[PDB]
Design a protein around this ligand. Structure first.
Ligand SMILES: *CCC(=O)N(c1cc(C(C)(C)C)on1)[C@H](C(=O)Nc1ccc(OC)cc1C)c1cccnc1
Length: 304
């Protein structure tokens, strides 16, 4: 029993984190095969960061202006290119600890593990979700830039997130590993708004299923609801509207608990209109949307 916000084991990723230095700016990079990936803002100085011309800035730099250290091993940089918002640095040595990996652009509502790094050294690992407005509510200080988000599928590391910046509101923005931002953000020091955050309804339902599985059944009621009626309520409360695909993804939890999705929905609707009244569910006084139906199954079936 139990239910925890579990992160994936970080071993496979620990051995790919390096430090990258360009003049006086230092941040994290990811060393896979013989390419180092990092945020292109490493070539910026203090002055450049309000309105940087990344083309003009990168033209002043040669291979030897870049210092890549992995522990006390200094890697020789022999090639450099900019792919959107990442630098790719061609180094002379292929990382001997390169796992099986792929690069994946994830969707809002999906979860991943973050390995927070300073100067190429891991400090901690946490699980979070890509919010519907393409931000993450991370825990990152200065120098965390280049920390990555990842999923593990058996032996295969899927890289989905590189950390680039903090918004003046305290939340976090970054790219996939092809250097495309999640959301409408730019890598310059100007004020930018994320739009409305919403709650990931399919994730809240998945956690309601986790709760029932672990003995917390008080919020289960007699009532039921239609999808259209459930959705009219969800929108009032800034919840994501639920489609047939969502119903399809929850089928296994529906099957395991013997509780129809639309009956679980009816239970959720009542919590929205009545609140928790001081009660908790898996020890939380709020509705949790940072577990996916997959996470819940994986955690409650002991997948390695
Ligand atoms: C790794 C660098 C760093 O810590 N950092 C950063 C990013 C940039 C850009 C990409 C050149 C804007 O400059 N510094 C971020 C960060 O985004 N800092 C920052 C920039 C701008 C504003 O308001 C306009 C506010 C903040 C906090 C960073 C990342 C994580 C934690 N602290 C800072």
């Amino acid at each position: 029993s139990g239910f925890r916000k579990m992160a994936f084991p970080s071993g496979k990723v620990e051995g790919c984190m390096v430090q990258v230095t360009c003049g006086t700016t230092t941040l994290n990079g990811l060393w896979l095969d013989d390419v180092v990936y990092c945020p292109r803002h490493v070539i910026c100085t203090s002055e450049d960061m309000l309105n940087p011309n990344y083309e003009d800035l990168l033209i002043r730099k040669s291979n030897h202006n870049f210092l890549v250290q992995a522990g006390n091993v200094q890697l020789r940089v022999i090639g450099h290119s900019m792919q959107n918002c990442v630098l790719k640095l061609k180094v002379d040595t292929a990382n001997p600890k390169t796992p099986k990996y792929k690069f994946v652009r994830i969707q809002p509502g999906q979860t991943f593990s973050v390995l927070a790094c300073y100067n190429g050294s891991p400090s901690g690992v946490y699980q979070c979700a890509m919010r519907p407005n393409f931000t993450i509510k991370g825990s990152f200080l200065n120098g965390s830039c280049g920390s990555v988000g990842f999923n593990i599928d058996y032996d295969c590391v899927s890289f989905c997130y590189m950390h680039h910046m903090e918004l003046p509101t305290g939340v976090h923005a970054g790219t996939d590993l092809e250097g495309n931002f999640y959301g409408p953000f730019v890598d310059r020091q100007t004020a930018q708004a994320a739009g409305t955050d919403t709650t990931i309804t399919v994730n809240v339902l998945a956690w309601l299923y986790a709760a029932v599985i672990n003995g917390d059944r008080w919020f289960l009621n007699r009532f039921t609801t239609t999808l259209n009626d459930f959705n009219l309520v969800a929108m009032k409360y800034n919840y994501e509207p639920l489609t047939q695909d969502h119903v399809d993804i929850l089928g296994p939890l529906s099957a395991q608990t013997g509780i129809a999705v639309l009956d679980m929905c009816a239970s959720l609707k009542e919590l929205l209109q009545n609140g928790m009244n001081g009660r908790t569910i898996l020890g939380s006084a709020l509705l949790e949307d940072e577990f996916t139906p997959f996470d819940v199954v994986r955690q409650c079936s002991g997948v390695t």
